[PDB]
């Protein structure tokens, strides 16, 4: 399927144990996609002071369309030293590995895979 219905656990930035997916734009996008497939991906909602507490490169989920079965259609955009790789809509949050942190909420997304 070109899209996959996911429910992403929303994590508080200060709880996150593994604060990025790796060391290159290509690796973080690769790893983010694998964790999304494996159900091992969390979402951190971006506010003032969040991003400097996470590791670059960042992986964002961004709204790709204006929401089947409550699931917002999203795609992945990476960012390193202020350059983004991809072009998409509004940021829903930054993806991180989920290693058992207790979430505060769930974000229903339809991921362009």
Curated annotation (Swiss-Prot):
Domain CoV Nsp1 globular positions: 2-113
Region feature Disordered, mapped onto this chain: 1-113
Compartments, record wording: Host cytoplasm
Top-level taxon of the source organism: Viruses
Function: Inhibits host translation by associating with the open head conformation of the 40S subunit. The C-terminus binds to and obstructs ribosomal mRNA entry tunnel. Thereby inhibits antiviral response triggered by innate immunity or interferons. The nsp1-40S ribosome complex further induces an endonucleolytic cleavage near the 5'UTR of host mRNAs, targeting them for degradation. This inhibits the integrated stress response (ISR) in the infected cell by preventing EIF2S1/eIF2-alpha phosphorylation upstream of stress granule formation and depletes host G3BP1.
Name assigned to this protein: Host translation inhibitor nsp1
Gene symbol of the encoding locus: rep
């Amino acid at each position: 399927k070109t899209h996959v219905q996911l429910s992403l656990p929303v994590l508080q930035v200060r709880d996150v144990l593994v604060r990025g997916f790796g060391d290159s734009v290509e690796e973080v996008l690769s790893e983010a996609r694998q964790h999304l497939k494996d159900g091992t991906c969390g979402l951190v909602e971006v506010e003032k002071g969040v991003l400097p507490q996470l590791e670059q490169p960042y992986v964002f989920i961004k709204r790709s369309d204006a929401a089947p079965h409550g699931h917002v259609m999203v795609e992945l955009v990476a960012e390193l030293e202020g350059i983004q790789y991809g072009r998409s809509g509004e940021t829903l949050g930054v993806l991180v590995p989920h290693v058992g942190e207790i979430p505060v909420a769930y974000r229903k997304v339809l991921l362009r895979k």
